[PDB]
Amino acid sequence: TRGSDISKTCCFQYSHKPLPWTWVRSYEFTSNSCSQRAVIFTTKRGKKVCTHPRKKWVQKYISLLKTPKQL
């Protein structure tokens, strides 16, 4: 919320593994202009990782890291 709100960058590689919540912070969906829509999980080190929204494990990390409750 107080880092880089202008991080509208696309993604490409997708990690397939449960990241250690100890180093996880939040997440963020890619932009619509990107040619490959993908979710992203941010860690405590400041490194945002891209991932696929299809994988159920990712849907569990997004709802857990933070719920989309913004109108």
State the DSSP H helix or E strand holding residue 63, giving kind and residue range, or none if neither.
helix 56-65
Strand pairing category for 48-51 and 39-43: antiparallel
- Token pair 């989309």 is at which residue? 68
Task: Report the alpha-carbon distance of residue 41 to residue 29 in Å, rounded.
Answer: 9
Report the structure determination method: NMR
Task: Report the alpha-carbon distance of residue 66 to residue 36 in Å, rounded.
Answer: 22
Task: Report the alpha-carbon distance of residue 47 to residue 30 in Å, rounded.
Answer: 15
Fold adopted by 1-71? OB fold (Dihydrolipoamide Acetyltransferase, E2P) (2.40.50)
Strand pairing category for 24-29 and 39-43: antiparallel
Nearest Cα neighbor of 11 from 44, 47, 49 is: 49
Task: Report the alpha-carbon distance of residue 71 to residue 37 in Å, rounded.
Answer: 21
Tokens standing for residue 34: 């990107």
